Amino acid sequence: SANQRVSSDFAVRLGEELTAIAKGTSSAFEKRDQIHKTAIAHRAYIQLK
Amino acid sequence: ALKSVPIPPRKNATLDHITNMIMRHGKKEKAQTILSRALYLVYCQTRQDP
Amino acid sequence: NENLDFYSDFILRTGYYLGIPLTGPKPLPTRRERWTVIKSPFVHAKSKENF
Amino acid sequence: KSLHKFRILARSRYDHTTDIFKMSSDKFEHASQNARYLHDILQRLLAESKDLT
Amino acid sequence: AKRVTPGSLYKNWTNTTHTAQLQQTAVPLALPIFNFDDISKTLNKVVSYSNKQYKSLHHLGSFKKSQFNELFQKPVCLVREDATNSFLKKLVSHPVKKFIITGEPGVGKTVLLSQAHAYAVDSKQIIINISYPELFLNGRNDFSYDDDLKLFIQPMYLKKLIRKILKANDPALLKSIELSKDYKFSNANPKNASVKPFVTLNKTKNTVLDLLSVMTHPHNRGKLMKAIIDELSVQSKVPIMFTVDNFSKVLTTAYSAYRNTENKQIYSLDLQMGKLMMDIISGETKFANGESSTILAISGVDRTNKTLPVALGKIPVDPYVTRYHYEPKFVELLQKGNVTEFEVPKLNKQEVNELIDYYKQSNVLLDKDITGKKWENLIDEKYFLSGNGNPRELLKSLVLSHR
Amino acid sequence: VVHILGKGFKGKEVIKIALASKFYGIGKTTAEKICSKLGLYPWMRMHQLSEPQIMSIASELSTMTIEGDARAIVKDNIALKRKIGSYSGMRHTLHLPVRGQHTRNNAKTARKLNKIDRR
Amino acid sequence: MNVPKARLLKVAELSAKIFDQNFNPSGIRTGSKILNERLKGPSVASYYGNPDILK
Amino acid sequence: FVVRGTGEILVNGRQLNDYFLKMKDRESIMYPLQVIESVGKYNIFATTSGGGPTGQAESIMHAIAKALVVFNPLLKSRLHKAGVLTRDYRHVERKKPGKKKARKMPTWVKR
RNA sequence: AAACUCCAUAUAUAUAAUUUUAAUUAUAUAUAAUUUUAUAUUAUUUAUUAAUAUAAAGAAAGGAAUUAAGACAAAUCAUAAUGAUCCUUAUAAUAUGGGUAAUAGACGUGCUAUAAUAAAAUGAUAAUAAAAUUAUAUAAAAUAUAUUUAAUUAUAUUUAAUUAAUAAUAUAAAACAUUUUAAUUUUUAAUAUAUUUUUUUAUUAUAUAUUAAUAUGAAUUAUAAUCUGAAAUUCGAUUAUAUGAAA
Ligand SMILES: Nc1nc2c(ncn2[C@@H]2O[C@H](COP(=O)(O)OP(=O)(O)OP(=O)(O)O)[C@@H](O)[C@H]2O)c(=O)[nH]1
Ligand SMILES: [Mg+2]
Ligand SMILES: [Mg+2]
Ligand SMILES: [Mg+2]
Ligand SMILES: [Mg+2]
Ligand SMILES: [Mg+2]
Ligand SMILES: [Mg+2]
Ligand SMILES: [Mg+2]
Ligand SMILES: [Mg+2]
Ligand SMILES: [Mg+2]
Ligand SMILES: [Mg+2]
Ligand SMILES: [Mg+2]
Numbered sequence A: 001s002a003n004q005r006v007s008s009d010f011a012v013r014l015g016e017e018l019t020a021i022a023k024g025t026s027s028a029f030e031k032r033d034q035i036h037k038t039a040i041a042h043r044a045y046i047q048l049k
Numbered sequence B: 001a002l003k004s005v006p007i008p009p010r011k012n013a014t015l016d017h018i019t020n021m022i023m024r025h026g027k028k029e030k031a032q033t034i035l036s037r038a039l040y041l042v043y044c045q046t047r048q049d050p
Numbered sequence C: 001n002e003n004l005d006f007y008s009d010f011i012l013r014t015g016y017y018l019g020i021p022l023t024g025p026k027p028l029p030t031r032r033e034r035w036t037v038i039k040s041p042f043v044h045a046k047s048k049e050n051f
Numbered sequence D: 001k002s003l004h005k006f007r008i009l010a011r012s013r014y015d016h017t018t019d020i021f022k023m024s025s026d027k028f029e030h031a032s033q034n035a036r037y038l039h040d041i042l043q044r045l046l047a048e049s050k051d052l053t
Numbered sequence E: 001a002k003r004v005t006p007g008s009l010y011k012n013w014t015n016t017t018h019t020a021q022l023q024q025t026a027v028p029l030a031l032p033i034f035n036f037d038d039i040s041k042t043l044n045k046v047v048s049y050s051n052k053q054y055k056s057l058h059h060l061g062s063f064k065k066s067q068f069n070e071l072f073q074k075p076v077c078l079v080r081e082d083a084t085n086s087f088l089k090k091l092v093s094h095p096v097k098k099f100i101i102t103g104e105p106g107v108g109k110t111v112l113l114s115q116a117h118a119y120a121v122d123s124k125q126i127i128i129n130i131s132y133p134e135l136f137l138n139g140r141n142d143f144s145y146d147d148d149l150k151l152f153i154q155p156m157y158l159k160k161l162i163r164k165i166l167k168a169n170d171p172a173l174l175k176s177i178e179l180s181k182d183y184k185f186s187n188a189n190p191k192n193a194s195v196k197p198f199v200t201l202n203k204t205k206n207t208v209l210d211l212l213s214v215m216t217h218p219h220n221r222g223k224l225m226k227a228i229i230d231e232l233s234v235q236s237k238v239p240i241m242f243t244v245d246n247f248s249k250v251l252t253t254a255y256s257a258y259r260n261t262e263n264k265q266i267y268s269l270d271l272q273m274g275k276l277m278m279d280i281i282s283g284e285t286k287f288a289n290g291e292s293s294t295i296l297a298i299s300g301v302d303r304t305n306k307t308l309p310v311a312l313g314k315i316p317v318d319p320y321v322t323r324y325h326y327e328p329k330f331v332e333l334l335q336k337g338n339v340t341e342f343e344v345p346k347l348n349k350q351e352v353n354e355l356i357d358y359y360k361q362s363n364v365l366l367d368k369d370i371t372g373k374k375w376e377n378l379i380d381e382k383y384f385l386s387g388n389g390n391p392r393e394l395l396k397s398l399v400l401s402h403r
Numbered sequence F: 001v002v003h004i005l006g007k008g009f010k011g012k013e014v015i016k017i018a019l020a021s022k023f024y025g026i027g028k029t030t031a032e033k034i035c036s037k038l039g040l041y042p043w044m045r046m047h048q049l050s051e052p053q054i055m056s057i058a059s060e061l062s063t064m065t066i067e068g069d070a071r072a073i074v075k076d077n078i079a080l081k082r083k084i085g086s087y088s089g090m091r092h093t094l095h096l097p098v099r100g101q102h103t104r105n106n107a108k109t110a111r112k113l114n115k116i117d118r119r
Numbered sequence G: 001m002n003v004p005k006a007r008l009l010k011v012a013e014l015s016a017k018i019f020d021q022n023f024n025p026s027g028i029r030t031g032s033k034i035l036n037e038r039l040k041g042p043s044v045a046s047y048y049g050n051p052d053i054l055k
Numbered sequence H: 001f002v003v004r005g006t007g008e009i010l011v012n013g014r015q016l017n018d019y020f021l022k023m024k025d026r027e028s029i030m031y032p033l034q035v036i037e038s039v040g041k042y043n044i045f046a047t048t049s050g051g052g053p054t055g056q057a058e059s060i061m062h063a064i065a066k067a068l069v070v071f072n073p074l075l076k077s078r079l080h081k082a083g084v085l086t087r088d089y090r091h092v093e094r095k096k097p098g099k100k101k102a103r104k105m106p107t108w109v110k111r
Numbered sequence I: 001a002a003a004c005u006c007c008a009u010a011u012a013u014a015u016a017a018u019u020u021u022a023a024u025u026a027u028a029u030a031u032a033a034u035u036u037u038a039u040a041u042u043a044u045u046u047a048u049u050a051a052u053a054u055a056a057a058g059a060a061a062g063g064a065a066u067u068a069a070g071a072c073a074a075a076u077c078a079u080a081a082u083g084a085u086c087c088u089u090a091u092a093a094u095a096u097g098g099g100u101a102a103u104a105g106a107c108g109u110g111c112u113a114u115a116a117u118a119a120a121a122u123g124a125u126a127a128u129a130a131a132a133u134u135a136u137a138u139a140a141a142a143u144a145u146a147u148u149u150a151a152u153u154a155u156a157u158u159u160a161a162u163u164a165a166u167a168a169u170a171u172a173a174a175a176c177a178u179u180u181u182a183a184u185u186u187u188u189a190a191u192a193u194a195u196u197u198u199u200u201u202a203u204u205a206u207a208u209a210u211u212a213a214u215a216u217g218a219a220u221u222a223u224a225a226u227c228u229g230a231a232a233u234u235c236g237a238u239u240a241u242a243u244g245a246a247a
């Protein structure tokens, strides 16, 4: 996500993304929810093994 | 006196991991500078510990 | 090293009985020469040996 | 003055740090010849150094 | 496409932090105001500059990038007896008043220069500051040859410099100085210059303020600069403090990046800026006011050679050293000016304590240092980690050492 | 856009680099000499040229071997080699390496570029 | 390099005469290296050993 | 050479910041003096030689840990559990004869 | 098989007049670990025990060599040697040139690139290594040259010292600091502006194009010099001024 920014130095762009995340503003959360919804969509196949 | 005090931590674990992920070709100072530079920025913009 | 040390010891004894002050055998650094060669006679360059 | 002239004529053969003149010769095929050659060169340098005219 | 929105950070880190207004979020801490006449009360204690000092210093360029200033709402300094008080006492008492500030990289030479500027501002003085001499040595500014002056003129650099001198010094003193002789400059005003070809200044009727406010054509800006220096040199009312930072750059690059019509490098002293700087240092200009002083500072970002140490008498003269590493002309020009050396010493334990304390009050420390660590241990460890009192390294360890 | 001898230049690029790039026959050193001779500071841009300055650059740059002249010299040298009947001329004709390189492998760029009418 | 070149070259050729050494101030190609090179013939010739070994 | 005093250090006669640019090297050097809370009670005079900066810094730290035992011998365990009293045997391993830089091989072609 | 073995590791003794220095070293002998002890939680043949963790005593953690018997009628008669067969004015021996370097296609290995978590300049009380080489030698410092004051780079001039813990090859380089960097209008400069001054803000100019080769990239080639050699065309290596593909 930090590689979608205009600056030429990745320290600046990493800092910008981290600041945005600190305020709960970025698209990476949707990926987390998608993985968890997928895990739920696969409830019953977990086994003690 | 030194009994009750725990051993000070070797080194921060999450920061070491993040640096190692950024680090490449054996260039760790470059990675640490990048991360420390970014953390310095986020503090300056949020004034909260990074 | 065995012959070197034995002879050295002899040199010190000969010097002393002759009245010559001698400091003694100082271990100067050894020199290691190294060569490499393929073990096989004709063609197995993958197998090499160090001398 | 002669010492300064000697030191500056030795060029790379003199080291001011320890003040040791240094010179070797192996052009001639025996040690006796090389020793005489070195002695003569030292005399030649000394003679020129002492000549401040 | 536009790419960069009006509000966005696009420069590299150093320029981003330097110019992003990151100090807006800083808490407005209250500190005592810098004042040399009250040094007894502000000693060994962090202070903030006065408002007029802040204005003048910003117009002089005493605050540079890579100084961590953006951490705080405004730049602040610590009054170090060994560095600030001692230097200013030497400056006032010493009769020659010609110093070069030296010290290890990051020790705080620039800060000391800015403190000297603050003293000058509050002591009713005029300050001419060359913050970055590289700007007239790097070949990114225009240049022309003035046969009347027999020197190469850099109109862009001049224009900026006179602008800075006008906007940094208080108008009261510039008005208080009247011209000692007449001047007649070409007119370049956007509107008036159509009618008036030339502009004349007359004795005891116009001041140096009007001389600084005049606008001429580029080929004559060197004439204006020479007039300004001569006017401030002859006048004996106000003292003049000529300051140059990163002077090691000047001492190292004897030859600039400018090439004349024969594709030969233009010696620095063939330039006007280098020449007037060296004339002031060597005493040829000979300012009339007694309190007028010249303070120089070196920077670690610039290479080192045998020029300055020989000039300062630290090492003898070896005449077989190549010109790239030893410039005899600059050595004798420095020695002739009786420029003395002042070495900025490293912080001691108590100074580190005060600085870190103030950092704590400003909420710029990590919770690992604060929430948990003993103060004594913290101070000692930082004192260790900062090379025994290097302020930059101390700041780096506190806020730029996330590891 | 600054036009010099029919060459289009953006307004942002330095004179020395742009001159060395667009013109066939003048490199880094020749461009530096040209700019220094006419008194343009090293890192001057094409925007800041005045009409007299553009004219001087065009005039002074036209007293030395032009793009066409230099190309003619190269082509003439190849023609000399081929007419003499030398080995090198034969390689030029056949689109093959001329500096003793191996043809068993590679030799692609020689085939693509070596010819009697080399640019 | 403040000292004039004339003095330096005066020291140079004086030392050259003293130490029996060539002096070529102009740097012309004297070909001295050709003559001063050592003769390696004796060593190259005995590469295959003594031919007079008893048989 | 560790002698009691204040937290002053010198490497090869130079300052710590001049000799060791990386702050991690300084942190490693200071760790022994931190395991035991005595960072501002000893004077260090390091005289490292050989290798690169990290090897020098880590050899200094190991030597400091060894030297601190003489001052308070019943502090050995705390240092041993901190791992500063163990010598790091890790070192470059020899380039193997038939392959590239040790433990790496040229590409293997099935056919 | 393992172990003994070698490199490396920790310690002890010995040697060295600490000018062969570095003693923070070198190399001879020896010791050390294929670690021990304790506790608990486990499954078990019931501590007449294994793995799980803890604790405390330790400097204690690696690599190299050695790859059996048989099989592949695997490779080698071009390292060398022999059996059988074949040539003996030629299939044996010498010299001058050429070839092994040819190029449609294909193929296995690598080197160099396709730019901003990456390239370029500079960094003289010269940041910081190891292992090797120098009687068929290594070659410093200083000089002239290209080339400007100098530095860097490459030749030429001349050989300092050393045949080596002594002098030379040889100031390691990345690292780190500063400056720059097209695509990029995210830039420059003309004015004002100013408590961001190596810098911000307002107006004008900074054009012509788009999936693109740059100030990426160095392939191909023109010319002039230089090194080795008796000889550089087939067919060698460097430097400079131009060239500047593909990607
Ligand atoms: N508060 C405070 N900070 C200081 C002082 N002196 C130095 N610093 C800080 O130390 C760092 C370096 O200060 P500079 O003045 O740039 O140091 P310098 O030695 O002149 O720097 P170079 O020219 O780069 O060698 C910055 O972070 C300064 O803010 C001081 O007296 N007070
Ligand atoms: Mg500074
Ligand atoms: Mg061109
Ligand atoms: Mg390796
Ligand atoms: Mg010693
Ligand atoms: Mg075995
Ligand atoms: Mg077998
Ligand atoms: Mg079987
Ligand atoms: Mg077969
Ligand atoms: Mg055969
Ligand atoms: Mg045979
Ligand atoms: Mg035959």
Ligand SMILES: [Mg+2]
Residues within 6 Å of the ligand: none
């Ligand atoms: Mg072949």
Ligand SMILES: [Mg+2]
Residues within 6 Å of the ligand: H106
């Ligand atoms: Mg292979």
Ligand SMILES: [Mg+2]
Residues within 6 Å of the ligand: I115, I118, I119
């Ligand atoms: Mg790149």
Ligand SMILES: [Mg+2]
Residues within 6 Å of the ligand: none
């Ligand atoms: Mg060594």
Ligand SMILES: [Mg+2]
Residues within 6 Å of the ligand: none
């Ligand atoms: Mg060794």
Ligand SMILES: [Mg+2]
Residues within 6 Å of the ligand: none
């Ligand atoms: Mg040399």
Ligand SMILES: [Mg+2]
Residues within 6 Å of the ligand: I126, I171
């Ligand atoms: Mg270096």
Ligand SMILES: [Mg+2]
Residues within 6 Å of the ligand: none
């Ligand atoms: Mg293309």
Ligand SMILES: [Mg+2]
Residues within 6 Å of the ligand: none
């Ligand atoms: Mg290029």
Ligand SMILES: [Mg+2]
Residues within 6 Å of the ligand: none
């Ligand atoms: Mg080229």
